[PDB]
Structure formats: C-alpha cells, structure tokens
Amino acid sequence: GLMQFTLPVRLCKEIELFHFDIGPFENMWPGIFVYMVHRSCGTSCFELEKLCRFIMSVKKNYRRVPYHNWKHAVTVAHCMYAILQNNHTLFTDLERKGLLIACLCHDLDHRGFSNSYLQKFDHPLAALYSTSTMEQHHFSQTVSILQLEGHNIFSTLSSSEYEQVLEIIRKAIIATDLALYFGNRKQLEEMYQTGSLNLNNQSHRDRVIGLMMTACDLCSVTKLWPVTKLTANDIYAEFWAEGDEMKKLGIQPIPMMDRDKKDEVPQGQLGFYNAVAIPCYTTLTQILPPTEPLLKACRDNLSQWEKVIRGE
Numbered sequence: 001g002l003m004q005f006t007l008p009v010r011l012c013k014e015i016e017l018f019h020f021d022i023g024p025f026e027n028m029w030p031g032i033f034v035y036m037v038h039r040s041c042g043t044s045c046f047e048l049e050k051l052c053r054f055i056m057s058v059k060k061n062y063r064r065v066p067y068h069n070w071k072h073a074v075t076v077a078h079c080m081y082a083i084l085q086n087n088h089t090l091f092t093d094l095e096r097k098g099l100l101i102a103c104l105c106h107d108l109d110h111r112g113f114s115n116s117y118l119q120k121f122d123h124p125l126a127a128l129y130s131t132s133t134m135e136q137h138h139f140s141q142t143v144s145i146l147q148l149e150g151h152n153i154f155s156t157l158s159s160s161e162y163e164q165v166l167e168i169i170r171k172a173i174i175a176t177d178l179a180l181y182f183g184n185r186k187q188l189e190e191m192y193q194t195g196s197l198n199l200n201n202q203s204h205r206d207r208v209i210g211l212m213m214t215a216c217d218l219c220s221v222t223k224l225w226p227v228t229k230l231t232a233n234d235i236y237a238e239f240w241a242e243g244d245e246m247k248k249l250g251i252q253p254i255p256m257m258d259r260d261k262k263d264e265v266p267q268g269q270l271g272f273y274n275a276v277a278i279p280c281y282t283t284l285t286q287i288l289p290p291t292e293p294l295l296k297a298c299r300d301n302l303s304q305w306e307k308v309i310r311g312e
C-alpha cells in the first residue's frame, strides 16, 4: 500500500518549506518520507519494495508515547530534508541517504523516559549503554531493523560504503543526545571564529552533521506559533508522565517534569530558547546560511513565549 501512495500536488510546494507542519496529514507521513527520499536522493536509489518495508517496520517500532513517537521521527526527518534541499551541493549521496534514514530512526523504541531516569533507576539498557543510553539503543534498533530479511536497503552497495553509511547513521543518532550538543556547538564556534572549519575534514563534517541533527530534533520551535504551542503540550505531557512515575516512588521530579508547575512553562520555554535553541540555529545559520529561516522562526516563537509571560 505504501508503494501505491503518491503525494498530493498542492503539498509539493508546502513540504519544501522549513516551517511545514506534518500535523494534519497523519495518513501521509510514511508516504511523505518516501517523497522526501525520492526528491533528495531520487527514485531507483533504494529498491522501492525494501524501502517501504523498512519504513513501515520503523513506524511499528515506535511506541504510543506522547511526544517521542512516529510524528516526531517524521518531523525531524522533514527538517533534515529541508536542510538538505537548501544545501544540496554540500552533502554526498551517501550522506543524504543516511541522514534522512538516521532522523526517521533517531528515536526508535523510545519509552518516554529521559536518559537520567533510566540511569538513576538501573534500567537494563542503562547497563548496556552507560552513556548516551537511549541513543545507542536507537542505533541498535536501526541496525536490527536493517538486518531483517527483505529490509536491508543499503545492501545495494559496497561493503565499504555500507559501513560508511552506518557510522554516518550512528554518529547522527548519537548526536541527538542533547547533552552532547553543548560541547559540539562550542567547538564549532571556535572553529568558525578562528576560521578553522574545513568541510573536507571528516571530523568537522561529523560535528556539523550533529548540529543539523540537533536543529532537526528541536525543529518544533521552528514552526508557526499555533503549531509550536500544541507540540509543546505533547512535550510536557511526556515529561509530566515521567514526573508522575517519579512521584510514585517518593522522589520529587524536576520542575520541567512536574505538572503542578504548569505555570512555569512559559518561563521555562524562554530559557530553553535562549540557552539551547537560539545558540543552535545561530551556529547552524553561520555555518549553513540557507538554514536561516529556522533561526528566524525560532526568534518569532521566543517573542511569543515572552508575550505569554507578560500577558501581552
């Protein structure tokens, strides 16, 4: 059935925008990802039969969680598509394929619990993955979905180019760990200021890819305000679910995960934009000038949060 899907013509223009909202097209999300893979890398790059199989299995391996779900993976995948569609000459064929696959798989089998929750309560995956717990799980889930019969869509190419596209995918998926983003963006800033950024250096591309992953992961702040406000409700309902599960253990959660501190949500959002969101899209816009509309939309949403704080 996914092979049969062809996207409506009225959305070919809209999806190319950075602030495009996949929200009201739930039935199309799998076909929207196919469309994006078909425009960024072309049809006949993957064998269509195995690609749709790989996609539909990835959706099934996403849990019915409030925010870190299937809607989130496609949203992140789309933002990567818009970034690659506006920087087309800079990323190789193996990169455009791998990064769009990475984003659709970057939160595979997430349970709605932070990396801290799993480490603080000795979850089995925290034993396996001591640091970047969920992100190592997501990559392992990706590899396992790939290695299924009829699912390996990079089987079509070199055993070297195969291992290359995987460590592109692992690096990208690991980079979605927000804790690693701060050290990543700081080193890119030094490389930018000192004029030391060489995109012909593998270590530098890897840093820049990671920032793109963060920008895509946070791209909920790059939508129009009505879209951004309602995605925030999903984010907090998942945080508050982890907090509820902490209050049931005699441990008070942080205010971010505390539903009884709903009133502090606008102040917390403004702090997040200034400490995290703005620095991310600012450095990405400095490195990739075409990606400036992300920073512009993020600024408009900061103003909106300010006006909620002021009652304005």
Ligand SMILES: CN(C)C(=O)c1c(C2CN(c3cc(C(=O)NCC(N)=S)c4ccccc4n3)C2)nc2ccc(F)cn12
Pocket: 178, 217, 218, 219, 220, 221, 235, 255, 256, 257, 261, 264, 265, 267, 268, 269, 270, 271, 272, 273, 275
């Ligand atoms: C992983 N993930 C979803 C995020 O990280 C996140 C948040 C968090 C930060 N925030 C807070 C954070 C705080 C706080 O304690 N400090 C503020 C900072 N300056 S971090 C807070 C305090 C009281 C009440 C609510 C609070 N909500 C939710 N929002 C977004 C938006 C888009 C996005 F793509 C991602 N996110």
Ligand SMILES: [Mg+2]
Pocket: 106, 107, 134, 135, 138, 176, 177
């Ligand atoms: Mg992740």
Ligand SMILES: [Zn+2]
Pocket: 072, 076, 106, 107, 176, 217
């Ligand atoms: Zn994510």
